[PDB]
């Protein structure tokens, strides 16, 4: 992201900086702090990373890709609720990975 790759290292950074540091990007407003940053750069950027990995960013070595990136809404999902907005985060998370980021698994393994 900063160093090589563009948007490969941008989805974990603004997974990382959004949920990673609850504030350097968790509080722009709340409300615009999720939206503002769930269409920033999850809108192309979600619907482009995810179009080239589609697996919440596996390609990049870190741990693998579920907790890669899960880790980061599920401890935020599981502490506050992705957020400290869970309230409408849960429509915020559930977009941003219903929209086919979370792992295009049918949304979710199984839905029912």
């Known amino acids: 992201c900063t160093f090589f790759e563009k948007h490969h290292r941008k989805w974990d950074i603004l997974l990382e900086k959004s949920t990673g540091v609850m504030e350097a990007m968790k509080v722009t407003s ?16 979600l619907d482009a990373f995810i179009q080239l990995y589609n697996e919440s960013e596996i390609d990049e070595p870190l741990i693998q890709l579920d907790d890669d ?36 698994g049918e949304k979710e393994l199984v839905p029912r």
């Open 30 to 45: 709340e409300e615009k702090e999720q939206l503002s940053t769930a269409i920033d750069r999850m809108n192309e950027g």
């Open 69 to 104: 990136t899960a880790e980061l809404m599920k401890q935020a999902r599981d502490m506050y609720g992705q957020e400290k907005l869970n309230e409408k985060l849960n429509t915020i998370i559930k977009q941003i990975l219903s929209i086919s980021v979370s792992e295009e």
